[PDB]
């Protein structure tokens, strides 16, 4: 059934509409409240889905300010050059790729925006921040080419960028650092990124750092992309934070890449339902003007009813057929709707357009979004998949020398290309002095220039804190502290520097007590403009149990140097396990977006977060973080190491070097003795390794390597080897095994490519010697094993925390994962026994002495 009686519904809905034509809105509200009060003999509820028609009626539609015929001519050239770019790439037969159908359905939506809404980077701000659909990139390139920002040479090298004279497949700032700004091709990451970008712009205004009030964040999405949990999972935040600077544009062509989104249902109703329930302003751009009279003149309301009941499947079927089909299967459903088009021709019925193809309907939506205050607006634009392409959407028949598809597109959009020149696949340009060239540039000049464009560096000079400004952290600690305590103290040092104090963006994902951040809460405050020192001037961003949301706030802050020419230094602290494992794709996009900030993997190490177990004990985030080329990962053991690493990071990224790199520092929740910094250790700390101590021993020599919480255990093992076994050692603090492996890989790559020159020696091979070595970390064996090739010793035994975590004491976990002092000693003696320096019985005896179960299951399999 699903309707019961739709004629009674028409009477009720026609009664409140007529009440609004009787000095309503105020009278309408009084009647609705008295109606709902009388629902005492019944029930009450929130879904509320409106009719399958335009939100903005013609009566309330603004006058279109542009020259529609000139705009149509410019748009056809953009359409043509976009198709030409992709077809020319296809002709190469190199499996390059590229989309055409996607931009064809949304071309008019982007066009209205470029001609009348998108603000480019200007003097006051970085303009509008547009999250373009990745797949419509040939459409952006085609417009940029007409604007004279891209050459024909670049279009001809679309998706051929290795040799530097080409264009990226999708928005990738790392590859095109002066053109693209926001990565969006990994679906779901654009909508959530845009939500926290809009929130960050409000933060900059409330904190009095930049007037961002004239900036709008546009997130252009497809209906299929909305299935990503990230796409709608954070939409209530826009309502909470009153983000009236955010606009979601959902292109509903009722399809994805393998058929429709919801055939048996109506994806536009699903989206309207959830977004309206989430407190957003929903604007549906359903039908074009060719439908306006039919709707106005229909007293029966049968057309609206027919429109409401027809599902996505039927609408897809309809646009795959002809006018004769629509007359029978759409309008033919009722005598009232059949009578409406009884005198219409099949061609006349087929001409009826979808809202997302009508500039007048599109403009009205973007204008009402611009006017809406207190909430974000979602624009649901109804378009046709592969619009004006004539079924073959198979237009790669050009390889078969078939231009019947190219001819149709030329005809459909009245493109000024002759039948003879069509095989050449030519680009169209508007010359200086033409109506189109003038108009194209005049509209963009009014809107402060060209979009997209990117500034790779910030203009101001920050007077950063010196290493000596961290002073106290470089000295021995009076009491036992952790590397997380060291991190918070380094923040306090930076919060004293006049130049960067108000630029620091500490971000926390709920649990602040765990990271001892509660001190900073009363000092700098928690940003809370809507709902203690929780106000709009608050500096800390508390994002709750939402790692992805916090990562998106971090990304907005870490790229503020480029987006708004306002360097912001973010510090996102969270449980290390829920970093790269949970928000990994965002960390890759952060690399692409050239993020410059700090990720702090708190409560790290498999054995250190001892009682939490399997889904919290992190012994592998460093294996995930090393996959990102511009991420610099450290695992410091001491407080002074934290200070040196944080200072260097700050200098590299926000100093004059302006290095497009971001930092990852794992910090701990365990307290132990924090010694003073050895004289001259600064270079070694930054590079990844330095000799801490040399312990004397007459019975043999070993090298012992450690990092994080496990270093003090390797150091303990060094004392045992010396006292009980007379084995001397070189003890090394490895601040970064990853940076040492990268340095090694670089030297060996160079040595391979320069056979006629003296080989370069990796930094680890410069610091270390030939003596048998043992390495132990709180991370899986591969973390320490990755430097093997570059370690100058014959034997290099690695101990690590491979296997699933479990709940126990730090002592029991360190014995289980075989990384404590007892296992470091047995590993060291074992090497010397192989070398014949000590008896095999000494190693045997040590296993028994240290209560080591030689036949327990491999911790990886446990």
């Amino acid at each position: 059934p699903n309707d019961v009686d739709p004629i009674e519904t028409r009477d009720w809905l026609q009664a409140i509409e007529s009440v609004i034509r009787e000095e309503g809105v105020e009278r309408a509200q009084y009647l609705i409240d008295q109606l709902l009060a009388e629902a005492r003999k019944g029930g009450v509820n929130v879904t509320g889905i409106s009719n399958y028609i335009n939100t903005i009626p013609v009566e309330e539609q603004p006058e279109y300010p542009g020259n529609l015929e000139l705009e149509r001519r410019i748009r056809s050239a953009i359409r043509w050059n976009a198709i030409m770019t992709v077809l020319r790439a296809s002709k190469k037969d190199l499996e390059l790729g590229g989309h055409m159908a996607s931009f064809q359905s949304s071309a008019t939506i982007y066009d209205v925006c470029f001609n009348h809404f998108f603000r480019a980077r200007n003097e006051q701000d970085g303009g509008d921040l547009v999250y373009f659909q990745g797949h419509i990139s040939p459409g952006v390139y085609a417009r940029a080419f007409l604007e004279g920002r891209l050459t024909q040479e670049q279009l001809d090298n679309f998706r051929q960028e290795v040799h530097g004279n080409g264009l990226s497949s999708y928005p990738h700032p790392k590859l095109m650092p002066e053109f693209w700004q926001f990565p969006t091709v990994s679906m779901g990451l654009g909508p959530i990124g845009a939500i926290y970008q809009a929130k960050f712009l409000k933060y900059l205004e409330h904190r009095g750092l930049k007037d961002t009030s004239k900036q709008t964040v546009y997130a252009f999405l497809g209906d299929g992309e909305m299935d990503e949990p990230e796409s709608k999972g954070a939409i209530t935040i826009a309502t909470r934070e009153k983000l009236d600077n955010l606009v979601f544009v959902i292109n509903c062509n009722l399809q994805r890449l393998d058929g429709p989104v919801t055939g048996n249902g109506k994806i536009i109703n699903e989206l309207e339902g959830i977004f309206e329930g989430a407190g957003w302003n929903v604007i549906k751009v359903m039908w074009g003007s060719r439908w306006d009279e039919l709707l106005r003149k229909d007293t029966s309301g049968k057309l609206i009813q027919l429109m409401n009941e027809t599902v996505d499947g039927d609408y897809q079927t309809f646009k795959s057929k002809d006018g004769a089909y629509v007359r029978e299967h759409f309008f033919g459903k009722y005598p009232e709707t059949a009578a409406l088009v009884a005198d219409w021709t099949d061609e006349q019925i087929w001409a009826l357009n979808r809202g997302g193809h009508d500039p007048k309907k599109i403009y009205a939506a973007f204008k009402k979004a611009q006017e809406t205050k207190g909430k974000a607006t979602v624009i649901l634009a109804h378009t046709i998949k592969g619009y004006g392409m004539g079924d073959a959407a198979i237009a790669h028949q050009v390889k078969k020398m078939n231009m019947d598809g190219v001819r149709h597109i030329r005809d459909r959009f009245n493109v000024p290309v002759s039948d003879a020149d069509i095989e050449k696949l030519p680009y169209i340009t508007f010359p200086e002095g033409s109506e189109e060239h003038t108009y194209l540039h005049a509209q963009r000049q009014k809107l402060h220039g060209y979009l997209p464009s990117r500034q790779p560096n910030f203009t101001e000079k920050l007077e950063l804190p010196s290493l000596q400004d961290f002073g106290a952290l470089l000295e021995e600690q009076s009491k036992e502290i952790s590397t997380t305590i060291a991190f918070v103290r380094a923040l306090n040092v930076m919060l004293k520097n006049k130049s960067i104090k108000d630029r620091l963006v500490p971000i926390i994902a709920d649990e602040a007590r765990t990271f001892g951040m509660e001190g900073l809460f009363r000092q700098i405050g928690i940003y809370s403009p809507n709902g203690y020192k929780e106000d709009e001037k608050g500096q800390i961003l508390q994002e709750g149990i939402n790692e992805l949301g916090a990562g998106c706030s971090w990304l907005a802050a870490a790229t503020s140097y480029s987006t708004n020419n306002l360097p912001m230094i973010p510090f996102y602290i969270y449980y290390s396990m829920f970093g790269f494992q949970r928000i990994g794709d965002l960390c890759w996009a952060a690399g692409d977006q050239q993020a410059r900030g700090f990720l702090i993997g708190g409560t790290s190490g498999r054995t250190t977060l001892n009682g939490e177990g399997l889904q919290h004990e992190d012994g592998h985030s460093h294996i995930q973080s090393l996959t990102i080329p511009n991420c610099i990962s450290y695992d410091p053991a001491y407080a002074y190491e934290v200070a040196v690493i944080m200072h260097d990071g700050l200098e590299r990224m926000y100093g004059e070097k302006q290095e497009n790199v971001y930092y990852y520092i794992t910090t701990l929740n365990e307290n132990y003795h924090m010694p003073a910094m050895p004289e001259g250790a600064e270079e070694g700390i930054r590079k990844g390794i330095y000799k801490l101590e040399t312990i004397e021993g007459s019975k043999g020599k070993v090298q012992l390597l450690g990092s994080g919480s496990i270093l003090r255990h390797v150091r303990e093992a060094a004392e045992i080897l010396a006292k009980d076994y007379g084995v001397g050692s070189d003890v090394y603090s490895v601040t970064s095994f990853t940076e040492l492996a990268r340095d090694g890989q670089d030297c060996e790559r160079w040595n391979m490519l320069h056979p006629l020159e003296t080989p370069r020696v990796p930094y680890i091979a410069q610091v270390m010697n030939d003596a048998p070595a043992v390495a132990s970390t709180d991370y899986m064996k591969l973390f320490a094993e990755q430097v093997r090739t570059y370690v100058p010793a014959d034997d290099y035994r690695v101990l690590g925390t491979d296997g699933f975590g479990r709940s126990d004491s730090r002592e029991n976990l360190r014995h289980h994962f075989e990384v404590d002092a007892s296992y470091v000693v047995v590993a060291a003696l074992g090497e010397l026994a192989k070398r014949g320096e000590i008896d095999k019985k000494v190693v045997a005896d040590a296993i028994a002495k240290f209560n080591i179960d030689a036949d327990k299951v491999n911790p990886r399999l446990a």
């Binding site: 004629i7 009674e8 009477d11 026609q14 009664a15 007529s18 009787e22 000095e23 007293t299």
Partner: protein, 46 residues
């Protein structure tokens, strides 16, 4: 055409087209008396 959902329901039961009757209500609203006057005049057409 401005009418209450009661008058709209009354017009559908008696087969009265509310576009063919003039409303003398508050803001030109078609009242019960207006529909009565329209039905009374239509009976005279016999």
């Amino acid at each position: 055409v401005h009418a209450t959902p009661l008058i709209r329901r009354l017009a559908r039961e008696f087969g009265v087209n509310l576009a063919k009757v003039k409303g003398t209500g508050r803001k030109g609203r078609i009242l019960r008396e207006d529909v009565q006057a329209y039905v009374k005049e239509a009976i005279k057409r016999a």
